[PDB]
Design a protein around this ligand. Sequence first.
Ligand SMILES: CCCCCCNc1ccc2ncc(C(=O)NC)c(Nc3ccccc3)c2c1
Length: 154
Amino acid sequence: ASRLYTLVLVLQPQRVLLGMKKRGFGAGRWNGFGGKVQEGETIEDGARRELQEESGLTVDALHKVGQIVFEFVGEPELMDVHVFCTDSIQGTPVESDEMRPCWFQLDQIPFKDMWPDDSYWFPLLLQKKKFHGYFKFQGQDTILDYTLREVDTV
Ligand SMILES: CCCCCCNc1ccc2ncc(C(=O)NC)c(Nc3ccccc3)c2c1
């Protein structure tokens, strides 16, 4: 009982792109760009699609950086999130009714206004490490338990 998702971080040498989510689950937080993988779609194709749908950017090159499983108490389905990173994009970020993309300098990442798990795995992302994570949440604010380990292959 896990559902496949993707999550894309646009990480350049001095800045990262995040999107403020305007509606529904995780509204009011800065997010990477992601969503559910579709029937007959590869995980990487889904990641590329989600980046365009949510940011307006076209990815030229993607690489795998992690897998994170999320459990929410009272929710039967686990979220199996495949995380990707790129430095190489085309287009300019687009604000839509759903998302407002903004660049952040790396020492100004707005963790207080991000999912709480990000504090744990962003240090690894920023140093080009790969990882496997598991986070058990109660509601959107509380991590009950987690695991996080660096890996050589995602
Ligand atoms: C169709 C997707 C429904 C929204 C998923 C809400 N659950 C959830 C739980 C914990 C999370 N922790 C971190 C982040 C993140 O962006 N860190 C930079 C999350 N963003 C995320 C956005 C889309 C798909 C998958 C993950 C995230 C999302």
